[PDB]
Amino acid sequence: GAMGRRLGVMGGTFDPIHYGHLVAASEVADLFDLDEVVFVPSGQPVSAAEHRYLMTVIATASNPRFSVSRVDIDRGGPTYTKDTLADLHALHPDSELYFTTGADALASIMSEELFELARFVGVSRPGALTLVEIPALAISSTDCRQRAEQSRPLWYLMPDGVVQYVSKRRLYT
């Protein structure tokens, strides 16, 4: 990008992924001049990992600057962000890494050397380490699961392909 090789790392459970996440990634990419945003579904932080992976693949497929990595899922065991960053650094060693996730998740992970590996960006609804406010994050995976539980439509909260994956695999019923 304009500020050198930079890579977003969008950590999350994504159960399900939705337009709030996609908007957040898109915004964070623009603000920090990122070349790409790798979505990394957590292995073990909840639907099976293959579902969360495929929903993320379906959702990001059409964007040339988004991709999905299985590094946390394929590692096995609990998911640590130091391992995610190590793996992604090994793949893109000439890029500066920008780890992006929900601000609340980011408030907990800091319970040290993580800052040697990456810059951290916390996203939330409004109200080194940077906080970015995203109005579309009023959409949440919790509402999405409840709507699916109650048989209410998910249209326009997420890509059609993800609306259909959730319905076809009966994910939250």
- Nearest CA to 165 among 73, 40, 48, 39? 48
Tell me the window of 27-35, 42-50, 87-95, 116-124 that interacts with a second copy (CB under 8 A): 27-35
CA atoms within 13 A on the CB side of 107: 6
Whole-angstrom distance, CA of residue 94 vs CA of residue 6: 8
At position 145, the amino acid (one-letter code) is R
Name residue 156's amino acid. Answer: Y
Helix (H, G, I), strand (E, B) or coil at 68: strand
- Per-residue contact flags (x/-) with ligand NAP for residues 97 to 136, judged by CB under 6 A: ---xxx-xx--xx-------------x-------------
Q: Does 42 contact ligand NAP by CB under 6 A?
A: yes
Separation CA 12–CA 14 (nearest Å): 6
| Contact residues: ligand NAP, CB under 6 A | 10-13, 20-21, 24, 40, 42, 45, 79-81, 100-102, 104-105, 108-109, 123, 137, 140-142
**Where does this chain bind a second copy (CB under 8 A)?**
19, 22-23, 26-27, 29-30, 62-63, 125-126, 135-136, 138-140, 143, 152-153, 155-157, 160
